[PDB]
């Protein structure tokens, strides 16, 4: 979604489930080398910023399935997001 | 293809498995010197810059080689660009 | 800002919060071609002076909007400066 | 556009993002012998320099498709440059 | 304080309890982004290379409030160093 | 053809792709003596006034057969001074 | 071989892997002082217009041995210019 | 020798490695006033037609020092000349 | 062996037991500079990626001995392959 | 001292304790943009070329402050290299 | 002992009293710093990787000091392997 | 100073940090243009070859201003040039 | 201005600053092919002695607007030359 | 040894272990401004290409010291070229 | 020296360490005019070909200060054209 | 001066920086009509030629203005000539 994309400094600083949000786009978006890529650096914000960093080559339906699994993760950083 | 030749701008931008790339593209197409090329300037659309700086040596059969790896790597990324 | 330009020795030596920086000014104006060349030459300090590098191309409108960055960021480094 | 010829010291000082300038205007204008000229000389001004050195080849439909492409990549430049 | 900046090779080599101190300084200093990068390479000196990785970023009225919190940790560490 | 005598003032000054139009028109018209008398005088209008130095010699068969180079290289150049 | 006056055009644009067609022409053709005239002009096809400028005080038994290099390099570009 | 008059139309039109005979024909023929008389009107075919311009004040002992400086540099125009 | 060089993307991706491997190839090929360059990457096939970096200052007898390793240390993938 | 000099290639190979080494070199020779620039390249002798390299600027009473730094480290590296 | 570089490779594989290991090589070789990296990836032979990690620096009166360490921990391991 | 031409081939060989060097220059004398010029040909002694290259437009009240600079950076540099 | 006429040795010899001074006379006074005449004979006053080249067609109105780009560029080469 | 200048093809291609070479022929052959020039253009193949550079400078009795290092570094590649 | 005179041809071809003489013969006998006309046709030859074509403006007590400069630097390229 | 008349068959051989000859001596003695006249006929002896060509029109007070750039230059030449 744009929700990903426009709430990109937020989305890097107050995501806190990124270990559970990497096996929800496993295999569909990101490969192997991509899902090793993330699981360092271990400040919990640098691996957003290496999972936005595969973002620009995502479209929109998939962009979305992000969306998806943070809200089946966390469902209260969405909403604080959105309101 | 001319996917390949047509769609230049994107593929560098939006290209993000250029080291799985250059393995199914090594020995077909790119020898050991051109494969360590494309291994340097650490921005990932520079890797693509270094790739298709060797696209104009190839003919028609090779450059769907490089079609076929992105299929099989991407697969989303080939369809975005065709729809 | 100007504060930018008038501490620009101060800000590469002394910013350690560089891939926080990079996320705030992400879509505004750090495309992802250059989001990815500051993210290399792992000295600290040459993450600045690539990000330095790109700033000539700035306006005032979006100078000012790093320093809202360095504000939420550092909150010390700006006032150490200013003081 | 006349704004390309207006402005070309302001083009060669304050562009920081020729790299994607050149995608998008190869094969529209710069062949790969222009393409390839341009990538040196690691001044960043003097990438421009190289640019600006195939401009008095250029008719006006093709000088402000490099305006669309300093729109797309800047946005701030083009407007920092009219204001 | 320059205790800080003074004894750089002791407090690397001879603080064992950087798991408090980041604790004392979250917030204040060291973002979550900071707090997180800190929290690896688990050599106990290594926590502290880490921090003072972060510390030219550091004004004087913040580097002694690092001085206080070693002071309510260990007590004896900084009084062996002064003597 | 007649228009690489009309146009020889605006040739001189705007075609930015002299060391390709030398490689389409070697063997055919250039020798090696006058291929290497081109490639001097770095100023790059100093390419065609030496281009049309050899230009008295040909005839009417070859002096399109540069026209199709120009086309091939440039076509913006050559409908721009059509039109 | 006379395919390699005969493609002077193509081989000029469409070699890509110059810097190891000049190892293996080292010491049979190219002396130092020529193996180093070549590695400058870093536009690619400018290498091979210095490669093609020592062509004419070369015969047959070396021109194709030149051919047989970059039969080595690339195999897909001699097709391509032969089919 | 008489090599070097007989092929005066070939060796003008097909030495490309001119710079590297006048080092070798300098101080034993060449004066730097000669010297620097070839090192101009930079199509290589004229640095031949001034480097024969000084040859008919030369006798037969240092003609054929410059076969020798012919065959030390090229090995391959002297033999496809004498074939 | 050809093995070795056959199947070179398939031992990139697939190869899960490389710190095993470079204790049997230590000293008998790897260099203790050379043992310290692949422990680093840590996506599990850029240390592959990273040993096959050296494979082509490697003859026939010693590249071998790494099929003996991998025979040692899989023996299933070694056979996948081959099947 | 000149044992720094003079043992060049065996204190790259030999020594591991690099990140002690720089602790001791801080402020007395290493500034915080040479102390960053160490410590990359993750093959342990590759941080002791980056070292060696700043080394030329250095004068003798501080090349034995290093010399220092390695007996009060490893005591037996620097005596099997004298002995 | 050379037979710690010799059997380098079943020194980690079989080693499984290293916590014993790095007590007596402390305060001889082993620093704090050294000490503690040793003490974490918690797979038991790569705590013996990051012992060999500080072999190099080593001389031969203080790697059979280990071999007294080995003897006096297994007392079988040192025996199988030399027999 | 006179300090700066007196010692200009030792502050080529034995000047190691010329990246800080650059940013105390930068605004007061070095372009932008010309900061950009210095860091390439990445031989370091290189980079102060083309720092003197820009030396001789520079008058006393700012050849000093670099003397300032190299005794905030170094100290021991341009006092082993002194003794 | 006189200025520009009185200083003509030592503008040629001190100035350093060569391809920003022609941006800023394009257009107002150098051509394209006066433009592309200076940027050759690589030594940095060749390019001001063809400069100066031009300066005999100048009236008073444009010169003084040269010594306004070398103000904006040099302000130190200009009050040396006074002073 | 000849042995580096009949091998200059294979030596090129198939060295991967330049760092360590480098250092080894640092002070006898190589100066700090020849050891900074090779440690660049990171294909490793142009690290060969930079280094056969500076070898028509040197003499018999140190190309074959470069063999030595060739021979305690490879030892299979040496052999591997002479049989 | 003579020397310098008497082995001109050799000190063209195998001199591989120019930017290092110039430094040496700056000031004391290269301007800085003659300086920057040395630094340029890249074939490193040629700026051998350049600094003696400067040197027929030489005496004998500072041709043998280039001597002392080539046996600084090379030291086995001088002993080996005595010997 | 006399030294120039008495000197004057080596003034014009030996003679090797005369393009800052001819900017010493533009103005006071040599108009632009006569500086444009002597830049040309490439053998530098030719263009003291062409200088010598205008001083049978000087008088004591200028000719020794020549002895003075000369001695600005040089110092050497100078000295060899009256020694």
Request: aromatic share 10%.
């Amino acid at each position: 979604l744009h929700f990903i994309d426009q709430h990109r400094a937020a989305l890097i600083a107050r995501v806190t489930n990124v270990e559970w949000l990497l096996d929800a786009l496993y295999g569909k978006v990101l490969t192997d080398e991509q899902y090793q890529a993330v699981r360092a650096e271990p400040t919990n914000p640098s691996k957003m910023r290496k999972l936005f960093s595969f973002t620009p080559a995502w479209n929109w339906t998939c962009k979305d399935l992000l969306l998806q699994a943070l809200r089946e993760s966390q469902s209260y950083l969405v909403e604080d997001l959105e309101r």
